Amino acid sequence: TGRDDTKETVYISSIALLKMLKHGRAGVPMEVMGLMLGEFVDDYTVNVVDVFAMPQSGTGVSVEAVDDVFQAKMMDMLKQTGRDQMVVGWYHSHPGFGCWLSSVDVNTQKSFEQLNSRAVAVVVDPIQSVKGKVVIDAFRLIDTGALINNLEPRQTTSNTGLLNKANIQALIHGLNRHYYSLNIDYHKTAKETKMLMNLHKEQWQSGLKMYDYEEKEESNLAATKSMVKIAEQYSKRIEEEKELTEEELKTRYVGRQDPKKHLSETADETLENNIVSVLTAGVNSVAIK
Amino acid sequence: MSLQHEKVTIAPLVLLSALDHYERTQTKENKRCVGVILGDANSSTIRVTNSFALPFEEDEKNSDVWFLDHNYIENMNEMCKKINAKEKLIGWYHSGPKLRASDLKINELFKKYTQNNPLLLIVDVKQQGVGLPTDAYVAIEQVKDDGTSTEKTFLHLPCTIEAEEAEEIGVEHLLRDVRDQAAGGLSIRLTNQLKSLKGLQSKLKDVVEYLDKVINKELPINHTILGKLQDVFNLLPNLGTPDDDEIDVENHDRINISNNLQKALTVKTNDELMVIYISNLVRSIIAFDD
Amino acid sequence: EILVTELTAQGYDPALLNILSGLPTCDYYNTFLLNNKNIDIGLLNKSKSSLDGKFSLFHTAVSVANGFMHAGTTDNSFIKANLPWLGKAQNWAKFTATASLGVIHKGNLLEGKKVMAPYLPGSRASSRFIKGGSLYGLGLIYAGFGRDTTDYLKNIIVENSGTSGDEDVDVLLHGASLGIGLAAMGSANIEVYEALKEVLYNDSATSGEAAALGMGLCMLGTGKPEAIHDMFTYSQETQHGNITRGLAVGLALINYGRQELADDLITKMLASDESLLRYGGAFTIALAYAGTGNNSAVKRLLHVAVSDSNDDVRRAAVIALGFVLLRDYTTVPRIVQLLSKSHNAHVRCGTAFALGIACAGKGLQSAIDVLDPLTKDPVDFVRQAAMIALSMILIQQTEKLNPQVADINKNFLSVITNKHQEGLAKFGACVAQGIMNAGGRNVTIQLENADTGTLDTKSVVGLVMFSQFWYWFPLAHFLSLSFTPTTVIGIRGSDQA
Amino acid sequence: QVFDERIKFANQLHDEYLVSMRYPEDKKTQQNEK
């Protein structure tokens, strides 16, 4: 009777990830969902290798919008190219709400939880991934008898400490009384690192192209006028600056917003702009000539 | 069928999707994986969002014999709309390492699907190149002015990227390198300069042996390359012009601003010289008292 | 192992040759600890109240902590007091608890089997964690003395290496493999290397990580090429992170003390695309040049750390420094003052470990001061390391011999008392508390002996295994090999009393 | 030609600033006065 529940972590590959993000953004604010194709290995590795949508439904997250019916169609299509694997759970998109599981999401998850004990549920916020961050969390329900027995400590075996939440109060109400969340790591290859990085062709055309100088004259013009104003703000501060506690001087004789540092900043950021202009210029004189 | 073609922008997802698809069919070791390629077309820039594998067999003694499951594709397209109902057929990817002469016959079969002339997107699976490790071609049928009949032949389209907000941030999210092939600090752009100079050196050298090979390897007189080669010579720089003198007078200008900006820094650093000395002056008294 | 044979054919008295095996020598140390040990039974109660046996992380801390305190004599006071508390845990925490018995009953060779026998297979079938974790704990008792024991444990492994095992068998075989590492340490048994090579080839998930570790412990300081080749390649064969990691850090043990003939390996491991092989490559430098402050070794470790953006790797490279600079522990606080200055958590974690290992002997006021705000940092993983490092540094000094000993002791206690802190912090103070009181305050860590001014092999081996505790808790028990008892034992040279 | 020279003249004063600024600082911080 019973199978143990312990810390896992869901490795979402780059390939997989980009499809959830792309699909979710387009279809939002309507919830899009679909199943996740992958592998289960060892008991700390949920490996999600590929994903694909299940048709967009107005009912949102539901066993009605998945069905074994549509999934069998999708499977036979993947089967013939020999890319079929084993289904590791399901994903869904909240329309702008943080990652937690609803009562209906949990009930979808319970249908799957009978079928594989390690099956995971993944909330994507593709409308929170307009940041630098990517907001996606995965959860897994803990059995009815165990929560009552307080086997919450059981769930913290086989990690060394990496816990950090991105939400509380909706996240933290479901977490104590239903589910235990899993952390997500991201997997890449070294080929992918180059593709991700290059969003330009200007890495062998950046020594033979640059900006026109009319804009450089706009920027250099603006820079000098500014440094005169900041030099006055900076002279005003150093009327004194021998009275103890830096902070008090900055309020009284305005040194707020650190004009000393501010003038330095404008000097650095324009000084680098010109070194580029030169490096493109000199490459042209000597290569061509 | 539209001829509407200028460029190819490529989602990062495509490159990666096709890299795995090649190794999971397990048509590799000089055996090709050929799949369908999905995206928007009927616009100048062909916008490639996604790709899928197709069951494919490659006779390696004869690349002019292959297996393609025509039925399957129709099945697959219905599933592509679920994902995104702007995905329609736009071509098929090839897994490199480059263009072949067995590709025209494969291209034929892909005309029963696409409303645009079938794209051939070479996804290099080894990552060779000095830009994006993709070439793009499209098959266009055109008369030849040399005296021979109408051929179907592959003209290159440039390779480029553009990306969705979700995809672009995901890229950075996965990635963790600070990148010497894009701009950044001064040192980072110094790496880009040296490379660009060497990039001109590598490519100009390639034209020298290509002109020689037409008359010493008996490649044919291809008028389309050489007309562009002539327009390089017309737009090429000169010397001793008042245009080239104005450049020198602009060198004076910008360096002077840099000169003054440098001198401006030095003022600031000499004040921090002086502040620390005020910090030194206090520390003298404390040393005496103890 | 070979020297005694030569002396046998010179002709000697059999007394000397027992002493060279070391069995008498263990007995003399046993007696010192039986008589003079002073343990804190109110502390045993206090940890028990603060940290729960039904809370699996909390139960690990208390099991480890008491075991180090009670170490060096077979005393059953921990078992009887906490007789209902031990059973409440399960999974690998209850595995840790069974092997903490063998930390307390370390040594006592004649009686080693007697105190472990209610746990050992043949009358244990109730739990698979007990069955395997008693064999691990039996390995600690007989570590470096277990030549006969090697045979007995080997029957069990050969049985299980022809199978892929049940989950009953995997846990059982797990602790057999760490244990036989200990018993057959520094023996150069190619019989054992072959024995464990069969387990690696099963691809069993937790049994294979353990197999790799056990191979490294037996073949310590051999620099054998066959063994090196197999483990390094099996990393690519698997996708398991646990297993891949187990080979990487065991390869460090194998190249102990050859220094630039460990170089070919370092090149392979550092150039590897894998992060795990970079994690282990750092440890290969550490053991190879251990106890020698050569400029070259330390240079490479410093560079690897800053320039990488792999969290596991940054931590490992900085820990490795400490081993290389045991020779001159005067310099460590100045060199790693830099690294604690950089406010990255993993980096700060390895820096506390660098201070702790390097300076584990005589106390330094500075070493203490640099660690002190690192018990205050917001990241809780630094807080764990900082207090454990202070406990390694001041192991049995008096509070009239440096008055910071009593203060720092209360600082660990204060975190535990508090229940408003994080469990990571209460875990850090409690494990550190047992290290601080270790031996009953009779032993100290002897990195380099002053008896001849020479490096100690046992002290180095325990500490590198101990730094894996963050990735597998059972391995904490290896710190017992870094405890070497400090006493003058006078002996009558005519019948040995 | 001229602007180049002034720029290098500035660079030289920067360097002298660096070595001198920290050497007396270093004596005080080492020295006990606490």
Side-chain angles (χ1 to χ4, degrees), chain A residues 18 29 31 40 45 58 95 148 181 186 190 207 221 234 256 262 289:
Chain A
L18 298 151
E31 316 190 278
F40 166 53
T45 321
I148 302 168
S181 57
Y186 304 104
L221 162 71
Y234 184 38
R256 291 318 307 168
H262 206 193
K289 311 294 180 186

Side-chain angles (χ1 to χ4, degrees), chain C residues 249-453:
Chain C
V249 71
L251 281 155
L253 311 182
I254 295 192
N255 300 20
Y256 183 65
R258 305 183 302 130
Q259 283 207 2
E260 94 293 356
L261 305 148
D263 165 65
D264 278 20
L265 188 45
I266 300 167
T267 307
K268 291 175 186 147
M269 289 185 87
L270 270 174
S272 293
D273 310 276
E274 175 59 339
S275 285
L276 281 293
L277 306 175
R278 288 174 283 172
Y279 172 78
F283 285 133
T284 313
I285 314 192
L287 264 70
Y289 293 70
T292 316
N294 294 114
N295 321 138
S296 55
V298 184
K299 179 289 186 185
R300 292 192 305 227
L301 288 171
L302 287 159
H303 180 66
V304 162
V306 57
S307 75
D308 285 1
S309 315
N310 310 145
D311 294 332
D312 307 350
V313 183
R314 299 184 83 165
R315 188 181 290 212
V318 174
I319 302 158
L321 310 171
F323 283 122
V324 189
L325 304 172
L326 306 156
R327 180 148 82 70
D328 295 339
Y329 69 84
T330 57
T331 45
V332 168
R334 298 180 304 208
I335 295 166
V336 301
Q337 169 157 281
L338 299 172
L339 311 181
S340 58
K341 182 48 197 206
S342 188
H343 290 160
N344 272 329
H346 281 74
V347 180
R348 276 192 291 206
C349 280
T351 301
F353 259 77
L355 287 172
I357 281 172
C359 273
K362 294 204 201 163
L364 286 169
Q365 184 65 81
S366 68
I368 297 169
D369 292 345
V370 173
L371 287 164
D372 278 10
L374 310 176
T375 66
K376 302 308 182 81
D377 292 326
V379 183
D380 291 309
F381 307 108
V382 186
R383 298 191 71 189
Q384 285 165 334
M387 299 195 254
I388 284 165
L390 287 153
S391 297
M392 212 178 295
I393 279 154
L394 299 185
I395 185 175
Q396 172 37 33
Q397 309 189 11
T398 320
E399 43 275 30
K400 296 167 279 184
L401 200 48
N402 174 26
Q404 272 55 256
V405 181
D407 288 336
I408 288 162
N409 196 91
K410 275 172 185 185
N411 183 241
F412 308 144
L413 292 173
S414 192
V415 185
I416 302 166
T417 297
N418 288 326
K419 277 144 58 68
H420 322 307
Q421 306 304 325
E422 309 315 282
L424 305 156
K426 264 180 286 302
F427 180 89
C430 192
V431 186
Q433 182 62 40
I435 302 171
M436 179 81 170
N437 291 5
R441 315 216 50 177
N442 294 111
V443 307
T444 72
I445 290 192
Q446 299 269 140
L447 315 162
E448 208 184 51
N449 305 350
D451 304 341
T452 50

Side-chain angles (χ1 to χ4, degrees), chain A residues 84-238:
Chain A
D84 75 329
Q85 308 161 291
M86 184 273 300
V87 170
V88 284
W90 60 283
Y91 80 97
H92 59 297
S93 333
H94 287 199
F97 293 101
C99 300
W100 38 274
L101 301 195
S102 75
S103 312
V104 174
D105 299 354
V106 171
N107 297 341
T108 304
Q109 168 64 321
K110 274 157 71 166
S111 313
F112 271 57
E113 177 54 51
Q114 303 177 14
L115 200 87
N116 171 35
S117 296
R118 306 271 57 62
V120 286
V122 190
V123 181
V124 189
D125 294 358
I127 190 82
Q128 280 50 74
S129 73
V130 297
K131 304 172 196 152
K133 311 309 293 181
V134 165
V135 176
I136 184 167
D137 291 347
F139 309 83
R140 189 188 43 89
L141 171 66
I142 308 310
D143 181 47
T144 41
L147 290 160
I148 302 168
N149 307 337
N150 198 249
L151 284 165
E152 270 165 342
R154 187 174 60 180
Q155 309 306 148
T156 76
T157 61
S158 325
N159 78 307
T160 60
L162 303 157
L163 298 172
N164 171 69
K165 306 310 178 302
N167 183 25
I168 49 151
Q169 302 184 83
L171 186 150
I172 213 177
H173 300 5
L175 186 94
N176 169 275
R177 295 86 168 144
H178 300 94
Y179 57 76
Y180 176 73
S181 57
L182 286 302
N183 292 347
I184 280 70
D185 298 332
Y186 304 104
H187 152 258
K188 325 183 183 179
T189 72
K191 304 183 278 77
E192 297 200 274
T193 302
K194 313 305 206 300
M195 296 177 220
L196 283 164
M197 172 175 126
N198 298 337
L199 297 164
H200 46 86
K201 194 57 59 180
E202 300 289 299
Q203 50 181 329
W204 64 276
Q205 295 280 65
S206 62
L208 310 177
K209 295 173 170 53
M210 45 170 169
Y211 275 65
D212 308 322
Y213 290 81
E214 189 171 68
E215 296 102 46
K216 298 189 181 160
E217 289 157 40
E218 275 193 278
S219 319
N220 297 353
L221 162 71
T224 294
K225 315 159 45 45
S226 300
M227 278 171 54
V228 179
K229 286 207 176 52
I230 296 161
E232 291 194 37
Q233 199 62 271
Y234 184 38
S235 72
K236 174 195 200 69
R237 166 181 180 165
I238 62 172

Side-chain angles (χ1 to χ4, degrees), chain B residues 75-130:
Chain B
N75 293 138
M76 193 89 255
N77 178 235
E78 167 57 47
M79 316 309 275
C80 293
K81 298 176 180 174
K82 301 176 179 303
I83 302 185
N84 179 43
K86 310 184 57 177
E87 285 178 9
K88 62 163 169 75
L89 282 293
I90 67 177
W92 53 281
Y93 58 101
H94 183 78
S95 66
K98 62 216 202 176
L99 177 76
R100 320 190 296 175
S102 42
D103 283 14
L104 293 154
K105 288 85 178 185
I106 311 163
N107 197 275
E108 317 301 349
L109 306 197
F110 277 114
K111 302 176 175 285
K112 311 186 289 187
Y113 295 95
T114 56
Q115 315 193 131
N116 63 276
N117 286 12
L119 202 54
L120 160 58
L121 183 63
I122 298 179
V123 189
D124 191 352
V125 291
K126 303 177 180 79
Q127 271 195 157
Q128 295 295 82
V130 302

Side-chain angles (χ1 to χ4, degrees), chain A residues 4 6 39 41-42 44 47 149-151 153-154 156-163, chain C residues 54-57 90-92 128 205 239-240 242 346 381 384 424 470-473:
Chain A
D4 276 4
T6 197
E39 307 193 284
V41 296
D42 186 337
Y44 177 81
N47 191 29
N149 307 337
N150 198 249
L151 284 165
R154 187 174 60 180
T156 76
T157 61
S158 325
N159 78 307
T160 60
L162 303 157
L163 298 172
Chain C
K54 295 185 68 158
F55 195 117
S56 300
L57 209 0
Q90 287 94 11
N91 206 9
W92 299 114
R128 62 211 188 190
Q239 316 189 331
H240 302 176
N242 302 346
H346 281 74
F381 307 108
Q384 285 165 334
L424 305 156
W470 285 300
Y471 298 90
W472 200 264
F473 288 129

